[PDB]
């Protein structure tokens, strides 16, 4: 046994690409930490990844994380793509670089640092914390202050 800890994440974007933001909550024995930031030009998908990355990298020790998210991108990625990417060296079946590789690798590095337990939020049947993350992301998307320099503009 290590350390329980619960993490709720959410990403949001006003366009594609466009101003976006992420929301994330880190909870440990009642204690709760909040993460949030907005970017001038990004995508929903990158914001979903960021949320998870920020919360995870905030852990100063190996934990038993319960990562809750309603992002269809992260799910379909963790349960459909991730495994293959590691086998082909982060390249598409066509020997082509994968999209958002910068955040996917960052996410995977932080993941193996703990014992992750994914909880996919279905028909918005999420907890208040997931709603809170949604609010933080939307608020941040409407008030962008940084740039997502990792995003390769597809205009
Ligand atoms: Mn949302």
UniProtKB/Swiss-Prot annotation:
Pfam families: RNase_H. One of its GO terms (cellular component) is cytoplasm. The lineage of its organism: Bacteria, Pseudomonadati, Pseudomonadota, Gammaproteobacteria, Enterobacterales. Mg(2+) 1 binds at residues 10, 48, 70. It catalyses: Endonucleolytic cleavage to 5'-phosphomonoester. Disruption phenotype: In a strain that encodes a retron, the msDNA is abnormally sized. Its EC number is 3.1.26.4. Monomer. Gene3D superfamilies: Ribonuclease H-like superfamily/Ribonuclease H. Mg(2+) 2 binds at residues 10, 134. Belongs to the RNase H family. Keywords: Cytoplasm, Endonuclease, Hydrolase, Magnesium, Metal-binding, Nuclease. Its main location: cytoplasm. It is an enzyme of class 3 (hydrolase). This is Ribonuclease HI. It comes from Escherichia coli (strain K12).
